[PDB]
Amino acid sequence: GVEIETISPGDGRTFPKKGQTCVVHYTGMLQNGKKFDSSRDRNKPFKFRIGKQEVIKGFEEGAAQMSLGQRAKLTCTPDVAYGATGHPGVIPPNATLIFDVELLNLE
């Protein structure tokens, strides 16, 4: 269950593909909750690649549905990220995740 509420600006033609490494400013938000992660604070905007399932399942399909410069607004279902067990200390079990994701990549 991937839903996109697009903050517009980009080109809508440059899409990330397989065998590529993409760079994302991201910000984590809990539904009716607080900020638990911010790529803006550390200023190292999280270089990662596509297809190796390094990131969670909900975030991976959200990056492919974007283009260069675009700014999405994810809403991942609990069953695709952490809802069974829950991340220790940080994410409660069966929780819905909110993301502010902007794609500023290369390749």
UniProtKB/Swiss-Prot annotation:
Q: Which UniProt keywords apply?
A: Cytoplasm, Isomerase, Rotamase, Sarcoplasmic reticulum
Q: Name one GO molecular function term.
A: calcium channel regulator activity
Q: How is its activity regulated?
A: Inhibited by both FK506 and rapamycin.
Tissue specificity of this protein: Detected in heart muscle (at protein level). Isoform 1 and isoform 2 are ubiquitous with highest levels in brain and thymus.
The record's section on InterPro entries has: FKBP-type_PPIase, PPIase_dom_sf, PPIase_FKBP_dom
E.C. designation(s): 5.2.1.8
The chain's disulfide connectivity reads: none
Query: What Gene Ontology terms describe where this protein resides (cellular component)?
Result: calcium channel complex; cytoplasm; membrane; sarcoplasmic reticulum membrane; Z disc
Lineage: superkingdom: Eukaryota
Family indicated by similarity: Belongs to the FKBP-type PPIase family. FKBP1 subfamily.
User: What is this protein identified as?
Assistant: Peptidyl-prolyl cis-trans isomerase FKBP1B
Q: Which organism is it from?
A: Homo sapiens (Human)
- Gene label: FKBP1B
